[model samples]
Each structure stands twice: as C-alpha cells, then as structure tokens.
Target: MISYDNYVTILDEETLKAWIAKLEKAPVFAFDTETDSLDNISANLVGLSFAIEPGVAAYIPVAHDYLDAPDQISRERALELLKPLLEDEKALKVGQNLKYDRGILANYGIELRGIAFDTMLESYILNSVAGRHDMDSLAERWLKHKTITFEEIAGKGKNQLTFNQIALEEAGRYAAEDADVTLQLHLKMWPDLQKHKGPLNVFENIEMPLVPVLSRIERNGVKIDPKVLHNHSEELTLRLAELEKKAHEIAGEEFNLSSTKQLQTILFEKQGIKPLKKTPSTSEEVLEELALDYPLPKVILEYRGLAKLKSTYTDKLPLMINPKTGRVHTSYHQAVTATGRLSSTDPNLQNIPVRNEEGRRIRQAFIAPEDYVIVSADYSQIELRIMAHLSRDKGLLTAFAEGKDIHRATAAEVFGLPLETVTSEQRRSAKAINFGLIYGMSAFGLARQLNIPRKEAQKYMDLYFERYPGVLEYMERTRAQAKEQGYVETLDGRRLYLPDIKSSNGARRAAAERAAINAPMQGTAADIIKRAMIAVDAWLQAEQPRVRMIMQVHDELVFEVHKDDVDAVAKQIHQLMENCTRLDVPLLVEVGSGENWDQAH
Candidate 1:
C-alpha cells in the first residue's frame, strides 16, 4: 500500500513551479486548500495541496510562519503561479466538497475554471442514506484509511489553532494527506459512477458545474431588515399569546399548548378523541384532521401555527443577521437530500411556508438593500412539467403545451366536467391529487389532506389515472424497473439507487416504491435548476449585470437586482432560466419583484 511518506513540502518558488508543471501535465489531480479559518468568504487561505499520482503529493507552504519556519512565497504570488493551471480548461481537479475551495479561490481573485469531480457527490448520488459523505468518513469507508482529524492536529476547544499557526511539516503533511486521500477515494467512487451511466452524466454535467455557483450564492448573502423582523417578531408574540389563550379556552383546561404529551392527554383523556392511526400524535397532520371534528383541535392547530411562526421565523430571522455582511448567509448543501434537491441551513429557506399568511409575513423580513429590489424567478410547476416529460403523458403534454392551468385541466378531466364549468372546489381537489401523486401520497393520505372520504379520494385518483393512462403506465413501469434494476433514473441521467425497493418488509418496500416513482421528477427538477444556475451565473458575469443571485430555494432563484434594471433583469432571467434545459413540456417561469422576498414571490 502507498503511504503518506511520499508527501513533499514545497517552500521555494522553484519547487512550486515544478509541482504546477506536473499538475498541468497530469490528466487530473486531487486538490484541496488549508484555510486560516472556516469562513470561506473572509478567511485567509494558508496553503494548498495537490496529489498528482497515487502516493506522491505536494503541499505549498504559502503562509506557514510558525517558529523557525522555512521561507515561503506570499499567498498571492503562489496563487498567481497556480492560477493559470487552475483556470485552464484542460486541467481536471478532483476532491471532496470542492465547493469550499472553489469559493475560497474566487475570494482570492482566482476563478476555478477546470472541470471538476467530487467524491462526496459521487457517494451521495449512489447511496444517499449510506452514512456520512465527509472526507474522513469516505476515506475510512472506501479506502480503509483512518485520516487524521482536524481536531487532532489543531487541538480541541479553546486550544484549537488554525492551519497557519501549525508547524510547516505537520500542516504540510496533513494538507497533502487530504489531497492524496481524495484522489484515492475518487479512484474508487468515480468508477462506480461510471458503471452507472446516469450518475456519471449528472456528476459531470449537472453537479460539478453548480458547485461554484452555489459558493457564489452563499457569498452573495441576502440582506435582512432587522428592524422589520423585530416589528414582525413583536406582532407574532402578541398573536401567539392570543392564540394560546384561545386554545386554553377551547380545551376547557389550560395545558401546555406546546407539549406533545399534554396534547395527547388533552385529546385522549379530556376530550375523548380517538388516537390517530400512525400519527404525528400532536402534529399538524393529526391536529388538522382532528380539527375537522373537534373545536379544541382546531384552536390547537391555529395555536401551533402561530407558535411556529414566532419561533422559527419572526423571532429568529433578526438574530441570524451577520454583522459582517449585515445580511443572512445560508449554507447550501448539494448531497444532503435523497433526490438531487439542494438544501439550505443557518435558516432553512426552502422549508418556509407559502400556504399561510404568517409564513408570508415572516418572509417579508427578507428585505433588499437601498437601490436594490428582490427579483424572484420561480420555475412554474417544474416538477409536474418534468413528470409530464418523464411519463410522456399526452394529456399532460397537451395541457401544458397549450398553456392551460394544469390543475384546472386535470380537474375537468378527472371530474368529467367541461373545462369552463369546473368548480373551484374541483380544481382544489385536482391540485391535491396532482401534488399528492408526485409525493406518492396514498388515497387515504390524500383524503386526509383534502378532508374528503377515503372512497372519494380513491375515486378521484382512479378517475385521474383513467383520464391520463400514460401516467399510470409510467408509474407502474418505473416501480417494476426499480424492483428489477434496484435504481431509478432522471431524464438527465441522474441515478438514485433504491436499495429497499426489493425488501421483504412491506412497509419499506412500499416507501421505496413511492420514492422510485417520484425521485426522477424531483431529481430532474433539481438538475434543471442547477443547469439554470450555471447559465445564469455566466450571464451575470458576461453581461456584467448589476444583479447578484442571493438565494436558491428549490426551483426558485432569488436575485438582488438594482431597481433601475429590474425589468431587464427579470425578463432576461425568465428567458435564461426557462430555456436552461429543453424538454417535451415548455419550462415556464414566474417573475415578481419587491423590496422583500414575500412580496417579490
């Protein structure tokens, strides 16, 4: 086995130049950075590591200034030497979570232009639920190599020091180990991705290109009006108290409206309500279902909604404002979801409620700065559009092609009613079924969601399938294929392997079946948005538009644009994003603008 002994430290410019030449000639190299701190936007990058062959690697000691440290090139001069190769289209850089290094490079005035491969994304696309995909985990799981943890070298808690603070040999060895381990992991993982055609295409075309885009978005950092959020917080507090009092009155006994145990007791013992079947016991699903039959549950539902608004949004948004940017920075993760959808943390912007007034009010706190307006360009019904394309359902294709309200068209067909004469209620039911099927919601779940009888919900589903036979065919075929092949594929060749699809356990098999049916559509939508991001980022750079893409929540792309260019930006964005990818069904985008996100949406 190749060991870490071949790791070489490059402290002089001559050695550094020699290493860069090797990297330029090599087909690919595992690349990583050692930053002074974790803050990618502002932290000083101390040095960088590149593993060329299996065991051979070089660590440029750019900023290591520990006691008796050898003389080294300045960080800027070092990057200047390395920039051409990094920016060369012929070079390929491989790593885990290359987004972090990509962002850091950009901050240092280096645009990472080479094609990239990431092992983290490879592992995720193959088996998302198969433990963690971090570098240490990947090394141990794939290579049987135990990596020296950051905590081990930097010490722990108060004693922890940054990479630049560490001795040159120690830091250089640790840094080189990263690049080396990444190369080995990619060797193992990339072959697996290549064996599966879909995941390989997705990794090369979709996932890799979007890494820098997400990094740039994270760096853009959306503005938050602390004053506005504070005011909303106050209003929410009053509403919370009022709701709590109302909930107490309706229950006839004041119990902790927040506690689940108390809710179970109040509903079962005091109110004599039946226990929910496989329930969120005190959840919105259970409470909303019970609310239809009992007043207390109704009040409790309202109370919980208000409470969540207060806790999750109103009270929290202002506090999350970063003093440095005077904005909120959200971290976007590509590999977190089972499907390819991106998720945000530090404030989960995607999970924000769109159906409720309180949720909308909280969103209003996401205000743009002076002379800038929020432009929210959302892909209109992208997942369903993807579903139509994947299913090749002529009915869905015709409805979407003719620019019809799909839910209304679906309602007309499902209810056997004329398009013009379809009731609003019918449209609502169709909407439920439309989204419900994508989520693999059963008839019983749909019935609960729509507050209709189980038989009626089942009848609606049956009528939908009867009207759109292609969808039924597509779904059944996908399930059979998943069971046979143990995987599913999106239109763009992104594969999601469903290990449990053939499980003997009925419940698990059913769960995997639903995922198999819907994962393609969801993953396709995710792939589309990613493609849009790459295109739009290029547009922003090439056109020098005075717009900064600040947030990406699912199919929605949020940009902070100068007010003067709002119309131009919105129009160009709509066109660019809609045409991001071509499918059987035209991708439609909805554009809105305001001083804040909610109003813009």
Candidate 2:
C-alpha cells in the first residue's frame, strides 16, 4: 500500500502485447497468479502478475467475471502470449513458493523455465527457526511491511467470492502487489542466501530444480477405481454395524458406539471403569491399553477402526477424484516441516497405515488403470541404516554389511542368543527395541509397550546398550552437541534448530534431547529420498519413460509403470534410489508391482 502503485491492468490485445514486450526485456522478474481455487487440478486462472523491479508491477485481468467488468483479453489468449517469455531461457523468473505458479503455468501448456529464486525457500533456510514462510508473514518479518490480506478483497466464509468475482481495479492492485513484494523480497533474500554456503547449495542444487519436477508429477495425477472404493465403503458400513452390535453385547447394553461422551459414560460411570486417559477419553491408545483386561474396550477398538476407515478412506476417497483426469490429485507442501520432508494433503496418502490389514485394504482402492500397474519402491530399514551410518558402530556396520535380518541380529545381540537360536518373540522384542530407541522410548514406555515389568524392560535396554555401546555414545554426544550448538544436522547439512536444547525446564530439555537423536536420522532419510527424487526425475525426463512418478510418501516412491517395462523400470528405480546417497551403511530398496497398491507392496 505504501509504494507498490505501478499496478497496471491490460484490457486489450494491444496493451497486453506492449506490456509483454516491455517485461520480456528484463533479465529477471517475479511472477504470480490469482486463481479461483487452491486446487491446482481445477483452479481457473483469474489473472497473472509480474514485476520487473520494486514499486513496478503489472496485473493482466484476464478472467474477471464481475458485473460491468472492463473487457480483457481471454485467459487462454493471455497465457498464449505470456508463454514465450515464461518459457524463455533468458528471462529468469522468481517468486514465493514458485512450485504452485509453475504447476498453474504447466496446466496451460506453458513449461515455465529459467527458475531463479524462491523467497519462501530462502526465508525457510535463512531462519528455519522462524516459522511461517507465506508472503504476508515474510513481508512483515523481513521487509517491515503489512501487505493487504486476502479477506480484504474477497468476503469471508460461505459468502466469499473467488478471484474472478472481485472488481477488476481492486484485483489488479492486490495481485500486482504480490509480484512486487516477491521481487523486492527476492532482492533482500539473495544476499542473505549467499552468506550461507550450505543453505545456498541446498537452495540452488535441490529446492529450485524440484519446482517443475514436483509440478509435473502432481499434474500426471494417479488413477482411482471408484467402484472399488464404493464397494469397500459399502462393505465397511456393514462391518461397522456388526462391530457396534458386538460392542453392545460386550457392554451389556445398547449405547452410541460412535459418541465419545456416550462411551465415556458407559465405561467410567456405568461399567465402574477407571478413567483410561482422557478423550472423548475413549481414544484408541486408551482403549488398546484397557483391552488387555476388558472385553468391551477390545470390541470398541475394532469398532473405532472400522468406523474410521469408513469415514476417512473408504467413503471419502472416491468423492475426491478429479473427473477430468479420472484420478486423485494430492497437493504436496514443501515448507510445512522443520525438517525438509514434503507433506501431502487433500487425501493424505502419507498417513495410510501399512501394518494393519484393514488399512492396507484402503490402498487397494489406489489401483493403476488398464495396461499400467502400480509399483512401490520402499526403503528397507532406512532410518536404522541411517543410525548405523551416523553411529558407525562396528557391531551395527558388520550386521548391515553381511545382509542379515537386522531385528534378528538385534535379538541375538541383546538376548545372549545365537543368530539361529533367536526366537520369534525375541525377534519381535528386538524389532520394538530397534524402532523404540530411534523414537526415544524409555524403559517405562518400553515396559508398557512390551507388557513387561519395568525391571525386565530396563534389563533388556541395558543389555542392548551394553552390546551396541557406540549407539549410546553417539546419542550422548548428539545431546551434548545440541546443547552446545542449538541444532542437529542431517548428513547433507540440513539443520533442525533445537531452540530449547539448553532450557531450564527438565521436560523441555529432555524433549529436545530426544529430537536431537531422532532428527538427524529422520532428516537424513528425508534428504536421501529428495536426492533420489531429483535424480530419478531427471532420468524420467531424459529417457521419457513409459512410466510416471505419481506419488511420494515418506521413504516410498509410488510409480505407475507400463506393464511391459515394469522389470526394467523397477531395476533402474532401485539402482537410482539406492545409489543416490552414499551412506556409510548400504541403502536398500524393496521393489514390487501389481495392479493395486497393496499387492505391489
């Protein structure tokens, strides 16, 4: 509002032609778009804004639908003309979170090129400790500017109008201001980024190049068989109803199984049960713990699981299908996590449970189309593998190098048994122990998880530590390092700043100690997958494979490959992902293929 006053609205072909000519001459510029919705798959581009310098910007009001709106060149025509400049190698484009803009342009058949800088990413790396990387927050924090909020132009809630419905003049000023602000912030951030070599390398090498790669993957959109989901939904409905009936018989009365308040009354008041945590107090963790002695909580747990499947997955996934693509398009956010892991939303495929049969069945609904099969490439013991690399314990390194079963190896080492003599239960306990330590589980927590006395859990922990002394030493050193330096770093120098590492409070300091151990391994794993994605994506682009990298869920990369090329495609995928990161411990990929996701895994 102070000085971004050069907002121009192009109302005719001549004006659009002149502005495009003028702007194309700039060596670098910032660009952004105003869309009718947040969903990239179907969002209508209302306008696009560009900045050649501070205090100077242009907004082409291409699709304003307000009453008596000044006639403008069509959105189709505007982009048709804008494509050359956007695609040109000489015209470097910069923006805040440029991925969304890149995706929007790609939808119009314009492959935006010459990606220069992203302010959001710059701010993120500059001060990851200072959360919130959106434009408004960035402007305030870095530039001491309070830019206009979206609600100022568009009304709130149910009565809100999209970008296209706003007045042309108002829309031009607001949208143009974004590009102006972005350009100025880019100028500010570039110097700060140059001062730090590690973040600069991360930004230039990994983050910037990934904008278009992620956009292409997102737009390819994965197919879903609606009838499959529908059938599952119907089956789940019946299963949930049956579960409720069983719950009623177990409770000796009819009650609303879905109602947390009702279940609380039945369990704590009527059934004379102790308060099992607090929830709606009947949370899954609470019920699972209670289920050891009681029949009703066990039945109730199954009821809750089925009911959750019905509501969250079975009943909801089909409705989210994009009719034009006949697939589900999930939006991935890069800046959400403190560590550099990408989070997916809309239908969060990342959170779909893997260990449970009912949850894995939800994955079956995510099938490939005819002539294509779903291929899952997942890392095996990736975090533990990372732990070995970080700790470099001779005992751990030898186990991984020999290609033995890690859990069984842990079992043998911890329980004073031979590798061949390790029992199933011992291996199971070792499995829990391996995952538990990385997650910072203590002896008391271990006792609760393994259903053992605290003394026995402590003994198991002590024995495990005695065998793998280096892991304990590495953890102690990492905690001291965090306390000294106030951060933990991945192998590639991606830092997870731990502000509370030296806290006066015991609990906060303890929590920071846990994060200090966990973050590096987890963060390193994230960095590895990101490296794989970049390398594998380059492979896909160069060879133009008959396959597409459709979904990225944590350590797994899900692809839709042509059935004929599954073997060759999967071979390269394994090689690319495994060899991408040079860890001290070997990185391994388990590849499988099937028509549906569950079968592939």
Candidate 3:
C-alpha cells in the first residue's frame, strides 16, 4: 500500500506512464478532479485527479505553466491514458459525483465510458428523504473525516487561478482528498445500496451509464444565438418596469413592489386579512383572505405579476448566458429530485413556463444558430402511460392504445355524462383530476389550481375513483408496500426509499405516502426515457449519426440535427423512446421538429 506521505511527484512523463500502466490492470479504482470552481456548471480547465486500486494516487496539474511546455505532452498523454479507464466497461470507476469530473474531462476532448459507482447517486437513492448528498455530508456520516473546502485553498473569486497557478502541493492534497472521500463514501454506501435492491439496479444500469452520456451531451452543447437572448433581456426589462408601475397603481399607493416584507405588511396586517399560508421565510403571509376574496386589490395583483416577471424572467435569464459560448448552458442535475426527473439550473430550462403566452415568448430566447433547427421529442402522457400500465386499468389503457383523447374520455366517465355531451369545462376538470390524483393532491389543492369550489373538486376526485377503481387499488397497494418495504420501484427497478412513510408526524407521514403512491408512476417514466437516451446515444455513436441531443427535461429530449437527416433522426428517436420500455399499456412519444424549440412544439 502506498503511504499517505509518499509525496511522489507525478509531473515527470515516465512516472505518470508507469502509474497509468498499473491502473489498467485494476478491476476497480477511484477517480475525481479538482476544478477551480466548486459551482461545477461554469468551470473551465482546472486540475485532474485520480487514484488506482492497491493504494496508488496521482494529480495532474493543468495550469498555464503545465500547459505551456514539455509538460503539455505529458499532460495530453495522461488524459489520453485516463480516457480508456473511464470508458472501459469491465472496470468499475467509483467516485463522488463523478458527473462533474466526467463533464470537465469531456471539455478537454475526453469521452468517459465505464461502470460508474456513484456514491452521490447511491446515497441519495438509499436515503431519498434525507436531502443531503454533498461529499462532506457523506464523509461526516461515513468516514468521520472532514475534507478542506476548495474556497479555503484557492482564495475566493470567480476565475481566480489558471490550473497551473495553483500551488502543486495544495492541488495535490485537494485532488487526493477528493479521491479519498469518494473511496470512503463507496465503502460505507455500497452495502446499504445493495440491500435496497431497486435503486441499486437503477444506479448500476440507468443512472450510472448516464453520467458519461450527460457529460458528452453537455460537452457537445447546442449553439445559442446571443443576440436573440440579449434582445429578449431588453424586452423583459421594459416589461418588468411597466408591470411594476401597473402594480403600484392597483395597490392605490406608490411602494417598492420588490420588498417582500412591505408587501406582506400591506397584504396581511394593513389589509386585515387572513392568509392561506405564511411566506417561506417568515410567519407573515404575503397574500391574505381579503386579497383572496371579493375581487383582489389591484396592488396585490400587480405585485404578483411583477414578481413572476422578475424571478421567472428578468433576474435569471441574462445570467444564464455562457461567457465562452455566448449561449446559455443549463446544468442538468441528475440527483437533485426524489422523482428521478432531471432539474436544470443556471437559467432553469425545466421551470420555463410552457403553459402561458409570456412563458412561450421567453423560450424564443433559446434560438438555434444560423442554418440549424431545434428538434424536440416529448413522451406523450408518459406518466399516465406508466400509471395505466401499473394499474392495468382497462379503460385508460384502451383510450391510450386507441389514440383517443384521454382527457375527454376521463371527463365523460367522471362527470357521469355521455361522451358526446361532455363539455370543455368537464374536460378541463377531468384534466386537473388526472394530474392531481397522481400527485396525491388534496381537494383543496385541486380547487386552488382549477379555481373551483373545494367541494366540487372533492366530488370530481370521488367520481374519478369510482370510474377507475383499478387506479385507486394501485395507489393503495403501492402506499401499503411503501410502508411495509420502506421503498418503491418503477417497472425498470429504479427505487426511491421513503422511510418517512413510517414517521409519526402526520404531515411527514402524509408526504411520504404521496411519494409512495407517485414514485413508481413518475419514476418509471423517468427510467424509461433515460434508457431511451442511452440506447439512442449508443446507436448514434455506432452509426456515426450527426444528430446531437442538447437537453433532457423530464419527458422531453431536445436535439440539434443536421438539416438533411432531420426526418430520419426524428423517426428513429420517436420509435426508440416509445419502445424503450414495455408495460401493460403502450408507450407513446410525440415528435416535434422545427426551426427552434418553440417552433418544434
């Protein structure tokens, strides 16, 4: 075993070569990288770190001095050698959040491919409700050791040091610490991961293969039109100011609408109205009963509109543009959600309002570069499809298989009305019930979103269950299983443990119950789409297809295709996504191709 104090210099070519040769023989090894930025999204080149089995570790510095000279050849050689280890299927590559490292390496022209034993993803799957997946959190729980943070060594500032400017000793220690913690986390979590069979399979087959795949997809990012985004930013600014003025006029007084405290006081205390719920950070409610009742005051309405414009648009959109590519590069987080759905940050693409006209206008900012088009392929009612399969509800399955309008069918069944006489209002109400039931939403919750009476919403929910007893059975069975087994699985064996289902607290237990009921339906949909991505990526690479998958948002895959192969690629993608998983019901995918994402829809 190599001693911790060996301090062997890895700078020389021969020493690095010998280390690489030794690593090639190991069946399992640890790997990580120390980039300048902890905020993985905006990182450029930093240092690459690795440790092999039987206790050999090394760090390759990529700073200016290293990139400038004789060291450059050695650095390139080291990266080339590491590529096969990362890509090799036989070897198991363990790391803490290897996704970030894999992404950074791909930027340097390295394609990572291997069996990734991700401690971060594993820990989350095993303890989904804990909500702590950080490396330090793992170290504290397992190793009883605390690693020094990057901010301590690098001196805090954006773009602070070229990889080379960082001291060799400091870089070596930081890099080695990452590998060490990854190995430690694996030791602690691997056994527990295996015990929870459902998530274990998912981590091994689906999410693990995806780290490298997402790395490559992100590295081959879609081109963005900066001018379009900048123009959109200007338009948003004007709209924001206009909305702010409008809100003040409605309030019947001139006040800073941006201040939440002031708004809370005006809506609650000053107005003497009871609120539905308190603000997230304070006990004071921002919107009270008076605001809710008898034609909401103009000021409150204006404030809400302006707030959405600022948070959902003006403040976040401009910052999403990447300085290097002059386009927004949204980071796709693999382990952030309990539902296995992908979340986007740095101009959160996931939250972009697709339902509203204003939201659709914001999407125009995500324009393709000249001579290219955005092709979007979305799974059509994927969760519903999963639900039908899981529940084996004959009526729902028949509707989907026959390509019938599901909402209208549901409306007719739930409202006890003839199919021909089902009104648009009934269809809309049925649509709300379809989505709300899957989320474990209460009558009050459904009423709020649909703007209907709570009693009416309850009647709709009751009628829904009466019409589809199979769905109710499925929900009850799953909830019971979650309580008994302490976890739930999708059709593909992806697990999300809900220990809180056994909690004594009413709210906590109820939340867990909802997750228990929802996990299989939602998580299975996630698993199916991800499996399709892997299949598509492999096929594309093997056939040397020119299409590039730019973004994955839950049930959708956005591709940037060469104009000529658009039709062929779209057909292949749709077929692959639909047939990726087999359930009791057929899976349907909706393919949309256009000049840009908005046009594609």
Candidate 4:
C-alpha cells in the first residue's frame, strides 16, 4: 500500500483529456461513478473516478454544487471526453458492482462496454459464504486497508448529504479510493481465482455477462395497475377486521391480534395450549402446529397471513410504483444469497406466494400496458431435473428421458408399484421426499410434511435409496468432498464455501452437509437461468423486437411482449432457454402468455 495518497482531482479540460487518453491506452482500468441518489434511474452523476494502477487514481468532479465550490469540468463536457473510453469494446474496464455504474452511464447515452471484471463477482465466485462482498469489506480483507467509507464523508442518517453536496476534496478521496481499491482487489483476487478453473469459468461466462442483463431488466421496470392493488388492499383490510373480531370472540376478550405476547397468552394461558419450545414463542411454526388442533390459532394464522399480504404487497405495492415511470423497479442482488440464486428488494417479487388466492389476487396488479401481453416462461421441475443430472440415477434419468411425471415415477419406484397404478397421495409423498432430500430433509421433517409417521417416512427414504443407489452415493460423495475441500461447486464451477462442514457442533455440521448436497443443484439452476438471460438479452439487442424482459423469479423469466410478437417471441425464448446449456436430460421450458402475470403463470 502507498504511504501517502496518490489521488488527483481533474478540474480542467486538459487534465481530463490527458487522463482519458491514458485510460484508453491502458489494457484494463478500474472506474466508479459517484451519483447523487442510490436509485440509478433517478440518480444524477456527481463525478467519475478511475485507476489503472494499485495506488494511483483520479477523480473528476462535474456536479459539486456546495457553496464556494471550485470551478470544475461541466458534467456534459466530462462525460463527452470519457464516453469513447467507456464505450470502447477493446478497452476492458473493471469495478466493484459495475451494474450500477453501467446503469448510471447509460443515462448519459453512453453504453459501458468491455466490462472484463467485477471485483465483487470475483470474490463471490471464489467463496460466496466467506463474508460481505462490498468494497469496504473486500478492501479490508484483501488489501488490509481501511479505506474511506461513504458515511464518513457524507455523514449518516436522515440529514446525510448527496454526493454533489459533499466537498470536492473529501468526495474525490472517497471516490478515487473506490476505483483504486477496486483495482487492487482485482489484482489480488484475480490470480487466486485463476488457480481454480471452476470459479474462473463461472466468473467469466456466467456472472460478468449477467451484470448488464440484470441492469436492463431493472431499468425496464414492470408495469403495475395501482387501482387493482388499491382494491385488493381494501378487501384485505376488511378480511383482517373480520379475522380480528373472530380472534377476539375465540379469546372471550378483545386483544391485539398483531401482538406476539397477546397471542402467547391467548394460546398458552387462556386456550390451555402447550408451548412447543423457545421462549414459549408464538412464531409461525408453533402457530401452524396449534392451528391444526385449535380454532383461535387457525384464526390467528389466517389473520397474520392477510395482514402480511395487506401491508407487504396490497397496500405497499401501489406506493412503490415510481411516479415517473409508472412501474416498480426492484433491485436484484446477485451476491446476497449463499447459493447462486438472485434475490430482490424494495418489494421482493420472489417472496410472493404462488398457491394462495390472496397472493394470486396481488399478482393481478402486475399487468402489462395496452398492446402488450405478459409472457411467463418457467423451467419445469428444474431442481429435480438438476438432481437427476447430478446424481445420474437410472430411475430419475429414465423418468426424465421418457418425459414421465417425476413424482409419479419416484412413487412407483419407491413403492414397488407399476407406474400406471401410483395414487395421487403416493405421488404427493414421493414429491415431498424428492424435494426434501434436495434440501437435506431428515425423516422427522419428511414425516411432518407428509403427515406420516417417522417409521413410514424412514421406510420411504430407505426404499428410495434402495431403488436409486446412485443418489445416495452422490450425496455421500458430495458431503465427503465438501468436508475435504471446504467448498462445493455448481455444474458451471460457481463455488459455495462451507466453513462449518467439519464443525464440532453436530447441528452446524449437519446443516453444512445438507447444503453440500443441495448447493450444486440450486446453483446450477441459477447458472442456467443466468445463461438464459444473457442469451435472451443478446437476442433482444440483435432483433430489436418489441419485447422486454421484465422480471426473473426463481426458475422463471417474465416478459412484456407485443401481442403480435407473443407467439413467435415466446417460441424463440423457449428454444433459447432450453438450449442455453446441455444436460443429461433435456431442459424443458413451459411458456404461457396472458393479460397479466397471474394469468400467464
């Protein structure tokens, strides 16, 4: 690390021009954008920062408007000078979370190209379970440097100033350090990543290309019908009231339905129900158990469900619709989950329930505009299919190859019954076991889910292993490998480190073992969908079709397509998604289109 700072502030046209020339010649440069708001679409550019070497960095402030601020290059003039370098396909660029920077740059009519590396993705691909992948955390770990943090310069909480409001000197140091440290991080982590072919493959082929695809999806924000949400909110409010009154009647006294303490008293004291465990808690699981035998708990559970839907979706979604775009833009976080799956916030679309009536009603709000239809394409039983591929079990492979109902196939094999005679209940139990095993579910959990005795669950599990010994072998092999290597890999080589695989604590070790069995299948599914997104985005860019990818949830992709193009576009999408990667069994994409998200599903 450099003892003294080597950061420079570019305030004139000559300095900015010289730096751009130098950056263009550099093989790879790290850059970051300083913006006024966290919301990329609404954010205004405050400055740009770049570094081609470890310690040397530069920041060009263009929009500092604090009192008595020194003259600087105009935002338009600075971006004009930097646009060519930013857009040059051969001039590789690096950054920490380049997706946000790409979006910010796109607002200025400059497409950020040749993004060779993202330090965040590099670190994540190396070991997703290690720790935070943010710039500060990574710098602290890799560089042993406590670089300047944003809160230190801009202050914190409600009165925090925007980037433009911060003084140039302070902001420049913070911004320049971001680019410099990002460069340093790449240098430090890149070689280590190259040592492992799996991680490097995932980094280059899957994660890097996905950055812009996700940005486009986020920017193409899904349209919403606020009136539908408002109507649902009203209905939910009325149902919640009726449930509250029912709860009061059951308890023989008025009380707060939302209060856990009150619910505990009502269940354990007034209703004479025993607490299962843990602080005599009224948590969801315990309430679910109580709901099985008692009326008040049932009312409480239903009431809680409606209340959650009301506040989290019905009442909140309409307010979340951006006034400018008349749509909702969710921020997809690539690095948050331990597995490779994406998660979203500012209204998480993934968390919306799929089987419930209220949740279905809430989805009605996600409607396409006139002349467009919502096209939802989902991978069918992707994880189960992934399991068949990874385990290479004859039963599973044959079932999938023959296009048989997998759960029915499993039921027939495990029960020693012919495929034609498997009952729906038997198939349901088989379904639980199939998914449950992927999750490392034990006999106890399987019994609970299937409403069967432990002995029966154990018998089913034994029968499953007996018929498909390859699956058992695969699980044992994966667990052993995880313990030995302290990590596991997806099919594409995305690594998920298991720090507790050999822990002294049984529970922690067991949990890690379960994750070891499951991570590969889940992570591979994530990698496949990411590949599909990249492929679909390339198609969209090349064809310039009147179709935009609106949302990606689990194993599904949702699009807003013109009515005229829906049939052709969806078929093309189906082909692209299925052919994105080759597996032992064919990947099946189930595509449907309708007026709104729910109907499409």
Q: Return the top candidate by TM-score.
A: 4
**Tens digit per residue, CA lDDT, model 4, 109-223:** 9999998999999888888888999999999998889988789889999999999999888888899989999999999898898998898898899999999999999988999
Order candidates by TM-score, high to low: 4, 2, 1, 3
Superposed model 2: Cα runs more than 4 Å off: 2-4, 12-27, 258-273, 277-286, 289-294, 583-585
Please give the distance, in angstroms, between residue 582's alpha carbon in candidate 3 and its true position after superposition.
3.6
- TM-scores, all candidates, are 0.93, 0.93, 0.87, 0.95
| RMSD (CA, angstroms), candidate 1 | 2.7
Q: What's the C-alpha lDDT at position 39 in model 4?
A: 86
TM-score of 4: 0.95
Residue-by-residue lDDT tens digits, candidate 3, 291-356: 566233444554455457556755566666666766566677788888787777766777776777
Candidate 2 residue lDDT tens string, 534-568: 88999998999999998999789999999999999
Summarize candidate 1's per-residue lDDT along 418-493 as a digit string, tens digits. Answer: 8999999999999999998798888888887787887989999999999998888888999989989898888888
Clashing pairs in 1: 198-493
Candidate 3 regions off by >4 Å? 1-7, 36-47, 62-73, 80-91, 157-163, 240-253, 256-303, 310-315, 583-585
C-alpha lDDT values of all predictions: 0.84, 0.83, 0.72, 0.88
| Ranked candidates (lDDT, high to low) | 4, 1, 2, 3
User: Between candidates 1 and 2, which one is better according to lDDT?
Assistant: 1
Q: List the residue pairs that clash in candidate 3.
A: 63-163, 63-164, 86-113, 87-113, 250-299, 251-299, 274-289
lDDT of 4 at 26: 85
